[PDB]
Amino acid sequence: SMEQVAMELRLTELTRLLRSVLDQLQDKDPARIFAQPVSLKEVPDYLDHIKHPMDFATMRKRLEAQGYKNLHEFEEDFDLIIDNCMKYNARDTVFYRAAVRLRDQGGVVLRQARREVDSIG
């Protein structure tokens, strides 16, 4: 149908905007701490601690399959990245500190993303 196509164009355009958001958030992680999944070879107990692992490569795979229906879903995944790190790692670690800085800096990006998603519809 023509309606299914219009819906699909909307999803494509959301995906475009989320790709730009993702790039901007990942720039706030210049150490690449959150770039890839935590390795279960190197942290074999990880899934005992963290039930829903997340990282920027995994988000990128979902995004490119147009697997985010709305900004809420995307933000859920970004908050997992941060929240998983802040639980597994202690306050005095470069990992925790990286997550705090990513959260604080990403907030600004996500605030305007929400306005753009609402504004453009």
Curated annotation (Swiss-Prot):
The protein, known as: Bromodomain-containing protein 1
Bromo domain: residues covered: 9-113
Quaternary structure and partners: Component of some HBO1 complex composed of KAT7/HBO1, MEAF6, ING4 and BRD1/BRPF2. Component of the MOZ/MORF complex composed at least of ING5, KAT6A, KAT6B, MEAF6 and one of BRPF1, BRD1/BRPF2 and BRPF3. Interacts (via PHD-type zinc finger domain) with unmodified histone H3. Interacts (via PWWP domain) with dimethylated and trimethylated 'Lys-79' on histone H3.
Species of origin: Homo sapiens (Human)
Originating gene: BRD1
Subcellular location: Nucleus; Chromosome
UniProt note on tissues of expression: Highly expressed in testis.
UniProt cross-link Glycyl lysine isopeptide (Lys-Gly) (interchain with G-Cter in SUMO2), position: 41
Protein role: Scaffold subunit of various histone acetyltransferase (HAT) complexes, such as the MOZ/MORF and HBO1 complexes, that acts as a regulator of hematopoiesis. Plays a key role in HBO1 complex by directing KAT7/HBO1 specificity towards histone H3 'Lys-14' acetylation (H3K14ac), thereby promoting erythroid differentiation.
UniProt superkingdom: Eukaryota
